[PDB]
Amino acid sequence: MLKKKQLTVLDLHPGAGKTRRVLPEIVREAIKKRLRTVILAPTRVVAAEMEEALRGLPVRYMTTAVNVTHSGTEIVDLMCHATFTSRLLQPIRVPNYNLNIMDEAHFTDPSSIAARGYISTRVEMGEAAAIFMTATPPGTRDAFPDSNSPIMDTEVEVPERAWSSGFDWVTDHSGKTVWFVPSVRNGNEIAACLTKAGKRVIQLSRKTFETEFQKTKNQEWDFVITTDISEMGANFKADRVIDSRRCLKPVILDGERVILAGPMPVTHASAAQRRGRIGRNPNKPGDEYMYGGGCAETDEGHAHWLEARMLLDNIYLQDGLIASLYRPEADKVAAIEGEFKLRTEQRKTFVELMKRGDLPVWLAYQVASAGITYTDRRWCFDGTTNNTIMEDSVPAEVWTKYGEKRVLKPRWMDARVCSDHAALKSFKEFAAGKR
Numbered sequence: 001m002l003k004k005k006q007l008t009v010l011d012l013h014p015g016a017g018k019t020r021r022v023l024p025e026i027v028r029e030a031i032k033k034r035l036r037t038v039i040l041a042p043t044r045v046v047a048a049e050m051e052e053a054l055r056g057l058p059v060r061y062m063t064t065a066v067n068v069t070h071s072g073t074e075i076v077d078l079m080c081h082a083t084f085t086s087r088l089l090q091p092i093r094v095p096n097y098n099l100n101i102m103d104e105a106h107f108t109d110p111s112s113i114a115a116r117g118y119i120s121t122r123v124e125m126g127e128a129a130a131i132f133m134t135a136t137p138p139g140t141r142d143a144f145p146d147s148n149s150p151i152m153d154t155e156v157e158v159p160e161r162a163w164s165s166g167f168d169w170v171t172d173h174s175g176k177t178v179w180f181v182p183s184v185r186n187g188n189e190i191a192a193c194l195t196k197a198g199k200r201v202i203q204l205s206r207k208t209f210e211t212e213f214q215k216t217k218n219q220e221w222d223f224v225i226t227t228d229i230s231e232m233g234a235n236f237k238a239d240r241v242i243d244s245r246r247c248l249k250p251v252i253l254d255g256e257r258v259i260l261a262g263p264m265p266v267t268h269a270s271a272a273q274r275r276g277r278i279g280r281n282p283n284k285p286g287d288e289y290m291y292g293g294g295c296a297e298t299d300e301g302h303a304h305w306l307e308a309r310m311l312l313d314n315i316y317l318q319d320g321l322i323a324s325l326y327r328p329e330a331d332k333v334a335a336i337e338g339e340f341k342l343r344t345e346q347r348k349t350f351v352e353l354m355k356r357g358d359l360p361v362w363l364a365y366q367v368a369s370a371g372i373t374y375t376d377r378r379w380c381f382d383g384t385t386n387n388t389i390m391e392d393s394v395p396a397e398v399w400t401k402y403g404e405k406r407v408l409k410p411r412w413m414d415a416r417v418c419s420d421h422a423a424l425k426s427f428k429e430f431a432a433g434k435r
């Protein structure tokens with residue numbers, strides 16, 4: 001595995017012990033062989049779990065999710081997938097790691113796809129070794145993989161809205177349930193319904209993940225309503241997974257806008273990861289998995305692969321060369337390598353719109369490629385009337401940095417900036433010049 005020029009895919013089933021058993025073994029061997037090593041966690045919650053599994057070993061934790069006093073002589077760095085990609089984009093120097101380990105190497109966020117592309121290109125070049133750890137590698141057709149104990153799989157109609165009758169089996173359960181919903185807004189409705197019926201509900205999403213996940217250990221709950229974020233190593237002490245089998249897909253229409261299409265079928269990798277939450281205790285067989293639809297390869301034409309190409313086109317590799325996407329996922333986008341390469345000033349704007357502006361990659365690229373400086377927010381108000389952002393069936397309004405009251409009408413419309421109350425609130429602050 002550790003020998004150069006090689007990319008290994010560690011494809012053990014969910015719960016096989018890739019993070020607590022296999023990962024420390026690789027770390028010990030890497031330290032023994034003096035290989036400068038990077039460990040890539042998908043989220044800060046997995047980083048905290050990796051610290052527990054690697055406790056004692058000399059690892060430099062490049063995250064505030066862990067409170068450790070470093071000796072300064074560690075040759076193994078641990079950071080999130082997005083931190084790795086972010087530091088690659090910024091002027092800061094990143095070591096040319098001899099060994100690159102990616103946990104949950106199935107994560108389809110644009111920064112995870114970009115990191116895989118960068119690492120795999122370095123391996124293809126014969127510069128480094130890499131290990132991609134995942135139960136569901138890119139290209140998996142099995143939604144029912146092995147587990148530590150048997151799982152009862154049941155195809156059933158799963159409600160995607162509040163209900164008065166017809167789904168007795170959902171509330172007539174005395175155990176703990178993790179329920180995957182296609183969106184935050186869809187989860188709010190089902191959560192309000194379960195709460196009204198006397199259930200204790202915790203809700204998880206990308207923006208509230210670290211805070212609310214802690215509640216699943218600190219308090220007694222009946223249901224956990226989550227988006228696809230819990231597919232990335234999140235572990236619960238539950239006996240049932242209710243899976244709508246649906247997700248929202250960002251799609252770039254005619255290269256002019258981004259809409260959130262669907263809800264539509266999840267990939268086999270996602271369905272397997274969602275099912276993978278239960279059947280993890282070999283001493284407690286019989287965990288249930290209720291699924292409400294089929295799988296399809298909805299990652300083809302998904303905006304994240306185009307966005308990954310926008311990140312890689314702006315990461316230095318060697319002179320004019322540009323990193324390719326990891327081979328099993330390179331056909332999910334019809335992009336020309338190098339087409340999103342920006343000049344130095346616009347690239348600096350692109351990076352800042354993502355890091356500080358917190359804008360989606362596609363939106364940041366449209367603003368930076370137009371030659372607009374980071375603090376220039378006039379574009380948030382000069383788009384056509386069909387780009388009017390709506391809040392509560394009425395146009396959203398903001399006070400500009402000039403003190404004028406204006407309707408939010410962005411020149412480039414990206415549905416992710418107003419997909420929920422929290423996203424819209426952050427976009428309003430950005431359009432007003434608050435960050």
Ligand SMILES: CS(=O)(=O)N[C@@H]1CCOc2ccccc21
Nearest residue numbers: 060061062063064065066068070
């Ligand atoms: C994220 S932090 O505040 O905990 N600092 C970490 C740990 C020490 O090593 C490094 C190196 C570079 C950058 C961040 C860090």
